Amino acid sequence: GIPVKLLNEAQGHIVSLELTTGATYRGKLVESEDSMNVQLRDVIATEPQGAVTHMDQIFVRGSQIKFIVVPDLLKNAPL
Amino acid sequence: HSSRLANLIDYKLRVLTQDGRVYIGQLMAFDKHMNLVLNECIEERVVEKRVLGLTILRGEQILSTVVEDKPLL
Amino acid sequence: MVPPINCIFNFLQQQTPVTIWLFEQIGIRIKGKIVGFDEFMNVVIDEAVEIKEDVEKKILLKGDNITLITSA
Amino acid sequence: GKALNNAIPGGPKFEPLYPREEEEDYNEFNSIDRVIFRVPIRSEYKVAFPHLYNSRPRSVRIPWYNNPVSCIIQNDEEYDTPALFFDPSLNPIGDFTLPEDFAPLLAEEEELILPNTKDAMSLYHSPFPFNRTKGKMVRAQDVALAKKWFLQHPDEEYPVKVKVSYQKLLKNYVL
Amino acid sequence: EHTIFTQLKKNIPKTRYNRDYMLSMANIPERIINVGVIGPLHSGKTSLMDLLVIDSHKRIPDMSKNVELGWKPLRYLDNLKQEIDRGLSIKLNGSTLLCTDLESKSRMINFLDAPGHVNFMDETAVALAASDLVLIVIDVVEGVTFVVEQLIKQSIKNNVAMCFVINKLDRLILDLKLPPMDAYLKLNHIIANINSFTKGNVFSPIDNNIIFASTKLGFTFTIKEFVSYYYAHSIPSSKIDDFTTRLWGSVYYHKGNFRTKPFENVEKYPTFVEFILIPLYKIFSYALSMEKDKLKNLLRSNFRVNLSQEALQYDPQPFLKHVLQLIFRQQTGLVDAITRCYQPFELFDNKTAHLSIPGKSTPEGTLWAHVLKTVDYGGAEWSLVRIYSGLLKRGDTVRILDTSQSESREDDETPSCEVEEIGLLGGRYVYPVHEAHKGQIVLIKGISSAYIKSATLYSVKSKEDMKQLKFFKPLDYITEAVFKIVLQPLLPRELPKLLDALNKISKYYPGVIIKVEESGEHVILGNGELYMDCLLYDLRASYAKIEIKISDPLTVFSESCSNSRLGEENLPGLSISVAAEPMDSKMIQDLSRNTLGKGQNCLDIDGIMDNPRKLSKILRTEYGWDSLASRNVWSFYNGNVLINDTLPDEISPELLSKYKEQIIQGFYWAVKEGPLAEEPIYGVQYKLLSISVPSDVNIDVMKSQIIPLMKKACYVGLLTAIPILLEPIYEVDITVHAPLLPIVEELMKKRRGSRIYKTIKVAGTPLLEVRGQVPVIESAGFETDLRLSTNGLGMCQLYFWHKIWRKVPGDVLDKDAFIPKLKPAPINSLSRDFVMKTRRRKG
Amino acid sequence: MVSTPELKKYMDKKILLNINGSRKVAGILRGYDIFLNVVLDDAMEINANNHQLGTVIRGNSIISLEALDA
RNA sequence: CAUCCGGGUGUUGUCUCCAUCCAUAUUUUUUGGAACUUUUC
Numbered sequence A: 001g002i003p004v005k006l007l008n009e010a011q012g013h014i015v016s017l018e019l020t021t022g023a024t025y026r027g028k029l030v031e032s033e034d035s036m037n038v039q040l041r042d043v044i045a046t047e048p049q050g051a052v053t054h055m056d057q058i059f060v061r062g063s064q065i066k067f068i069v070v071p072d073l074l075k076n077a078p079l
Numbered sequence B: 001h002s003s004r005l006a007n008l009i010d011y012k013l014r015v016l017t018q019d020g021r022v023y024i025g026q027l028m029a030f031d032k033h034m035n036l037v038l039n040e041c042i043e044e045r046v047v048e049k050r051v052l053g054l055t056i057l058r059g060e061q062i063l064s065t066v067v068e069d070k071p072l073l
Numbered sequence C: 001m002v003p004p005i006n007c008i009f010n011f012l013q014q015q016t017p018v019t020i021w022l023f024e025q026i027g028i029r030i031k032g033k034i035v036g037f038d039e040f041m042n043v044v045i046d047e048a049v050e051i052k053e054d055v056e057k058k059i060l061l062k063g064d065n066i067t068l069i070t071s072a
Numbered sequence D: 001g002k003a004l005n006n007a008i009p010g011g012p013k014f015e016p017l018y019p020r021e022e023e024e025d026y027n028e029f030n031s032i033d034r035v036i037f038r039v040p041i042r043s044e045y046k047v048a049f050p051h052l053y054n055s056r057p058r059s060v061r062i063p064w065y066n067n068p069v070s071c072i073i074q075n076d077e078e079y080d081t082p083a084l085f086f087d088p089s090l091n092p093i094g095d096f097t098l099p100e101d102f103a104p105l106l107a108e109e110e111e112l113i114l115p116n117t118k119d120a121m122s123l124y125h126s127p128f129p130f131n132r133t134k135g136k137m138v139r140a141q142d143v144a145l146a147k148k149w150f151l152q153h154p155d156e157e158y159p160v161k162v163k164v165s166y167q168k169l170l171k172n173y174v175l
Numbered sequence E: 001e002h003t004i005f006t007q008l009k010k011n012i013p014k015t016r017y018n019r020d021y022m023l024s025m026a027n028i029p030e031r032i033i034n035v036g037v038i039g040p041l042h043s044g045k046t047s048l049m050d051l052l053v054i055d056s057h058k059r060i061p062d063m064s065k066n067v068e069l070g071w072k073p074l075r076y077l078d079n080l081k082q083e084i085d086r087g088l089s090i091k092l093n094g095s096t097l098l099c100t101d102l103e104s105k106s107r108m109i110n111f112l113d114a115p116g117h118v119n120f121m122d123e124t125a126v127a128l129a130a131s132d133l134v135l136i137v138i139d140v141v142e143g144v145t146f147v148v149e150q151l152i153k154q155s156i157k158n159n160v161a162m163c164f165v166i167n168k169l170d171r172l173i174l175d176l177k178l179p180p181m182d183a184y185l186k187l188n189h190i191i192a193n194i195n196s197f198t199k200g201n202v203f204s205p206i207d208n209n210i211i212f213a214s215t216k217l218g219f220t221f222t223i224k225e226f227v228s229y230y231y232a233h234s235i236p237s238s239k240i241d242d243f244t245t246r247l248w249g250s251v252y253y254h255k256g257n258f259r260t261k262p263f264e265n266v267e268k269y270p271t272f273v274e275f276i277l278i279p280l281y282k283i284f285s286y287a288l289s290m291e292k293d294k295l296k297n298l299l300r301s302n303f304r305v306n307l308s309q310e311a312l313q314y315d316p317q318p319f320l321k322h323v324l325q326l327i328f329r330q331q332t333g334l335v336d337a338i339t340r341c342y343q344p345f346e347l348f349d350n351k352t353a354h355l356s357i358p359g360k361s362t363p364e365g366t367l368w369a370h371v372l373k374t375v376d377y378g379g380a381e382w383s384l385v386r387i388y389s390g391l392l393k394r395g396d397t398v399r400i401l402d403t404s405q406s407e408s409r410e411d412d413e414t415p416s417c418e419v420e421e422i423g424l425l426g427g428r429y430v431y432p433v434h435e436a437h438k439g440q441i442v443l444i445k446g447i448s449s450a451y452i453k454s455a456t457l458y459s460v461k462s463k464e465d466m467k468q469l470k471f472f473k474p475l476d477y478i479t480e481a482v483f484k485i486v487l488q489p490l491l492p493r494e495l496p497k498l499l500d501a502l503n504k505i506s507k508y509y510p511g512v513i514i515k516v517e518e519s520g521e522h523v524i525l526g527n528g529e530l531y532m533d534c535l536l537y538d539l540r541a542s543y544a545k546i547e548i549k550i551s552d553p554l555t556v557f558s559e560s561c562s563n564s565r566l567g568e569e570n571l572p573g574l575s576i577s578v579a580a581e582p583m584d585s586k587m588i589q590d591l592s593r594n595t596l597g598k599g600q601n602c603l604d605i606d607g608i609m610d611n612p613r614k615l616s617k618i619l620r621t622e623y624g625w626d627s628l629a630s631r632n633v634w635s636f637y638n639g640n641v642l643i644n645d646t647l648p649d650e651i652s653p654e655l656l657s658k659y660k661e662q663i664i665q666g667f668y669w670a671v672k673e674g675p676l677a678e679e680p681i682y683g684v685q686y687k688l689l690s691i692s693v694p695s696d697v698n699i700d701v702m703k704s705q706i707i708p709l710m711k712k713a714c715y716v717g718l719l720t721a722i723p724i725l726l727e728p729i730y731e732v733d734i735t736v737h738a739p740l741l742p743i744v745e746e747l748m749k750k751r752r753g754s755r756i757y758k759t760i761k762v763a764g765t766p767l768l769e770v771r772g773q774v775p776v777i778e779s780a781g782f783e784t785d786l787r788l789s790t791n792g793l794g795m796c797q798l799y800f801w802h803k804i805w806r807k808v809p810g811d812v813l814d815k816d817a818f819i820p821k822l823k824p825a826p827i828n829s830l831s832r833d834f835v836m837k838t839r840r841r842k843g
Numbered sequence F: 001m002v003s004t005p006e007l008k009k010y011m012d013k014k015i016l017l018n019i020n021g022s023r024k025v026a027g028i029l030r031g032y033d034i035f036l037n038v039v040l041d042d043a044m045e046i047n048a049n050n051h052q053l054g055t056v057i058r059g060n061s062i063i064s065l066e067a068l069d070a
Numbered sequence G: 001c002a003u004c005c006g007g008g009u010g011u012u013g014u015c016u017c018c019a020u021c022c023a024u025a026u027u028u029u030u031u032g033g034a035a036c037u038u039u040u041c
């Protein structure tokens, strides 16, 4: 399916996302999955409060993701 | 099936989510889980707006779908 | 290394006392010894106790509600 | 060979083309004490390496060097032996299952081999006329069935009379 | 800048993905990659690249109507007329390409077309110096041979990941017409053969380290590539992955269930043949043999493919190629397999570390560039460099260093050149670049002047950072030149042009050595006939426009001996006595093999900077070397080895220590030259037996006295130790049909050396592998003698590995033997004849 | 299905997990699952009162997994 | 430098023959951790 391949193609670029938690994470993406797992670096979190933090490495569960936000050149990619 | 869903492709859509937020933009790619990809997106939390760009939603998060405008040339 | 279901298999043989946490409820926990289990992570606890430290006194749990399984 | 006035033993030979072979100047670079002597330096070497042995080349073309060396097997006595037959020449040398119905896709048909096919494979390795099934018509005088025969070594058996003829035919072709 | 780009953009033939995404991708260090392509003659290399090129580009401008259809393989990267006309790749040309993979995540790939002719191994070495990993392409018919072993040995030695491609599979089926049962077996044998030379790792059509292809025809396979594409649709995904593990070796499925048992019941085959080879054969048989109407049904039935009548209206070969390219889609099986086969962390420290000392310090924020090959493009000479670190941009002022200088390792040290432009190679065009980033390989304008051959490029803003920085080691080319040509111009007045040209040739051809004699003659060394021929062509045509005289092909000789000294200073205060000794062939071989002493491998003497205890341990361990002698190893020469050996070493070691470098400098000086022909010395060990030193050394023991004195003593020692001449020898790799064997035997006899080390039936083909050895001085024309005497059948390659100089027959110093001029020397003496002709040239 | 996740690089290293109910745990990563069930040793709660325990965390619960030291 | 024997293409008029994408209720999406209350602006 194409909605997963687009993700794999944004590996390397910087990504923004939203979780069921309520917070948004922003960073370079290293690995993804068909599940929608993620592996990122130099993340800059921002919760409901506005509280910023730093997280060196992160793994996720896709189930917990609401939606992603992806770079603009990834609209000319082949489907 | 999914015959109807291909018909929606490349139309500006109004998508309500479980959070209440509503995303808007064209539809580029579609899934069996209802993962939608949307181009030039704008949330309307409510007298509010934000510019995102390319957004990939999950199936869990989506509630309803509705066409805003016809397919663009 | 140690896979997850092989780790739980040790808790059956040793008959070790294990406290179980719940999914969306931090206020509640459980206790007891492990007789048996299955592929879907359902558990048959023996001499199980509901834990303010209000210790209230053989049951079965659904695998959907667990979070932590901890030795002693 | 023409340009350099060095014909191959089989080959035709022309006049020089470049006139002057006059300068034969003894010199330190050249001198026989200084040189080391082994090997003929046969004319074939000169043609093969026109910019190595053959000092001062002019109007010389760069020669093709080496084709991959083709081991094709063609059978010319019994057609009965199949298309895919190991020849004398070649050197000696409890878990998961899926429905039976699924199988290799192409192999509904029992045998790859066709009576027609064996010839077809042979054709693949054939000359200009045959290996194309689409051709434009040409005149009778145009065709040169004769041509190939001179364009090949005479061979040892033939008497001088035909070997000369072979060279003469080549000369015309070359010019 | 923009104007330049706009003109430039028109020139290049555009592409489907576009530059912007390909340019966009670059920033991630992990994204993108570097890959080199090597393999023996005509293995397909260039055409493999051509496949990728034709996938990528819509136009293509160059293609004829003829070539696009079928018969003539289109050649890309053969942009040199010489190569085209010669017909074999000579100088490597990169292609850079944004490529997709099975996952659908594209990466930028730098591809390098290296030449597979044995004389241009230097080119392969240059490519390897930059590439992360290597694709090694083997002809299914040819199998593997000595050069393949050499290639894999070096590749792994330098921690270059290796992925195999078995090419020309169609030939196995169409040329040899092998049965499927036997075809599999043959492939398996080949697979086995590669594995035995490899150590610590084991491939298999199931690890996806081996790819099956026909470049000519137009297809590439991995067992993964196939399963997903056609089988995968048929069956549940969970199960399928396993299918591949149950596909290779010893597995047969009877009817839904497959049992490792041989084939019980009736008709039987192992799976590879069942689901792969058989249908492949059917494709071949079916397309040529079958009525064109019949075929359509199968395409829709088996493949869901629909051809127009114009696709039928071709001919067997062009039709077949169309069909194979139709069915088997873009070569992403290849790309995907490459992608998931290399781990940066495992190799990378190791590969960087070997070129440079392990370190490492001041990582990041710093520019670093390795310059390997230089490129004679349409305009000027470009410099090819690997983005080791940081970022380059136009007009950037960059410091440049050359390795021999580096060998050596503040004000005066740093020359610099601004970087005028950076372009990205694409075979026949260059794509304009504003900036270059770490990972990628690029074309630089204007960095050329600083360096001949290799150089290391760095920018350092830090004094400690500068101190840390380690210069790249000189590239170690696979072979030594040996072949010797003497040049003079036809007209002496044109010398200046020749001189310029020779320097240019050194820049462009990394294996060439140009030396200048007293006489003004130019000694050129090159690897072999063809190599030198190409040099001469370019020299006369491309660079100089001067017609020149060329001599009679010779060879460099080496000096040696087989078993006391007295000596006197020009101002008789010093007196030197040094023993000269034959060395153990084992020792010699150990020295010739450039190594770190890894695994169980005897330590290379260039590891001498490690504790002498360790060095001596190796000598004692591997040779039973005398414990004093091992402890007294001073250094190696420019070649062999120096030992201290006398009571005065105990009497006045401090005094002696003061004179080591003067000795040390001299010895390289003295051994680099020689007493017979001013040529370098091999297999000789020297031992200082006595050294008298001037009373009260009133600045008396000067370098002016002892350096030449030492030199003299060496020469005397060699002479009295009974000197000999050594001659370099090639390894002759000959491929022939069996009945042509006797011919080959006679040729060997006739040449001089007449030595064949081995004869091996090439299992699976009607061919022999013949290994011999041949004296380079008797090699002139050897290859053509073979080709002609076998009537075009079979072929030869000469490769210098092991670099062993055999004793030249005759006694080094006897007057009597030789016979008059113009006569090949009698066998008893080739040593005496060799010296005099060389002696005269020296003076 | 059942894509066995890329947790090989975290094995035998310290972690900072987060779970449902805003509760989090430190531990040495011993083993992992298809469904991302985890085995942690030397488990310490983060209430800020840190209690040593000695643990198998469920897959569903997991929100994320971090690394303390690079 | 020319001649000579041939070839292709377009166009214009003619002639003959013929027609006018898989099926999963038990942990990463479609058989729910949901439900409910209250305070602040």
Ligand SMILES: Nc1nc2c(ncn2[C@@H]2O[C@H](COP(=O)(O)OP(=O)(O)OP(=O)(O)O)[C@@H](O)[C@H]2O)c(=O)[nH]1
Residues within 6 Å of the ligand: D067, D068, E040, E041, E042, E043, E044, E045, E046, E047, E048, E073, E075, E087, E088, E089, E090, E114, E115, E116, E117, E167, E168, E169, E170, E171, E213, E214, E215, E216, E217
């Ligand atoms: N029969 C057959 N020959 C092939 C195939 N692929 C490549 N070749 C051989 O490869 C030759 C042309 O390939 P090139 O790429 O030009 O040669 P190359 O491999 O670059 O050789 P170098 O330039 O010396 O490396 C032809 O003469 C073929 O014999 C194939 O699929 N079938």
